[PDB]
Design a protein around this nucleic acid. Sequence first.
DNA 1: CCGACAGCGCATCAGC
DNA 2: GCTGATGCGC
DNA 3: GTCGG
Length: 326
Amino acid sequence: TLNGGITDMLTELANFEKNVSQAIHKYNAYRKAASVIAKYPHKIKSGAEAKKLPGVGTKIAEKIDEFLATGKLRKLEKIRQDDTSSSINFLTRVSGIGPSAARKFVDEGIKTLEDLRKNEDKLNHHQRIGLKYFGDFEKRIPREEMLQMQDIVLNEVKKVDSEYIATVCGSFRRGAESSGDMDVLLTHPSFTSESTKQPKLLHQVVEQLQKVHFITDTLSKGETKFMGVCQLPSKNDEKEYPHRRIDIRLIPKDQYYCGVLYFTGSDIFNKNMRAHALEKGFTINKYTIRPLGVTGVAGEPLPVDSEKDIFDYIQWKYREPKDRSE
DNA sequence: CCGACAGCGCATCAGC
DNA sequence: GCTGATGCGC
DNA sequence: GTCGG
Ligand SMILES: O=c1ccn([C@H]2C[C@H](O)[C@@H](COP(=O)(O)NP(=O)(O)OP(=O)(O)O)O2)c(=O)[nH]1
Ligand SMILES: [Cl-]
Ligand SMILES: [Cl-]
Ligand SMILES: [Cl-]
Ligand SMILES: [Mn+2]
Ligand SMILES: [Mn+2]
Ligand SMILES: [Mn+2]
Ligand SMILES: [Mn+2]
Ligand code: NA
Ligand code: NA
């Protein structure tokens, strides 16, 4: 809002760098500048003012000066005039179409959704599904729908085997009023880091959710990670619910609560607890928390039976998920 | 001046 | 066939 | 593109 013009500009530049230039570090640099500016509680008056913020450097400061002086950016104006770059950038909005497939499509004269529809035989399965649900995938999920999805997923999982444990993580678990997708973590007492005790633990769950027509499509599935599409059941001549993105991860239970911590997030809170965690000489990844030795050497992973256990190790107060914004 | 900027599972392709 | 690289989205 | 070593 306050510097929306600037941050829109930076976001536009980030998408260009990612999708057209294929320069993911520049993408992230621009994102990082836009994010720090978005949190700044003043109307930016000059580039030099902005350069004081971490993540804003000499070149963005110059771009901000030009934008403040003229109401636009020549670089971006020129990018908007480039139909080919605009098409490449647009196509990467299809899930499964990255910067490289987008460029390849456009070089073959495939430039719009309509072109994709008439060239399906050139899309892989992921891309076909991304195309099929192009609009739905960009829509957000209201919390009320998430609650319903949680209730379906948690109970259907237990019907396959009462000993399964599933947890809906991500922004939902942080109490967010809307979510972009559904992140499910799954475990079972038979699955531990050392051994596979049961076959097809993830496959049977996915099968069950297909059976009750909650899961409608699959982007990818292996022995530990499922990515696909789901949809709430529609009551009588009610409008259809949008198709939603769902991810299910099968985690060994001896690593389960480290996973839950990681995939609960947020983004900026994980680093805070990590960078911190080095305090007391502990290192934290998504699977484990290990002690750091006097020489810098990570020890064996400590036992974790709950999320609180992780907190008891680096000795901080258990933080409720709602409080993990940063 | 320089390389880091996360690293992984899965699908697909490259190169034998 | 095989193995390793790359593209992609987390 | 920006940062830190
Ligand atoms: O590449 C990743 C993947 C996951 N994570 C973490 C933190 C995060 O909050 C969580 C879920 O990843 P999402 O992409 O689903 N973001 P989130 O669920 O928090 O918000 P959204 O409603 O937009 O999905 O796991 C990362 O930090 N980086
Ligand atoms: Cl880059
Ligand atoms: Cl502009
Ligand atoms: Cl580990
Ligand atoms: Mn999520
Ligand atoms: Mn997600
Ligand atoms: Mn081949
Ligand atoms: Mn510097
Ligand atoms: Na700065
Ligand atoms: Na895409």
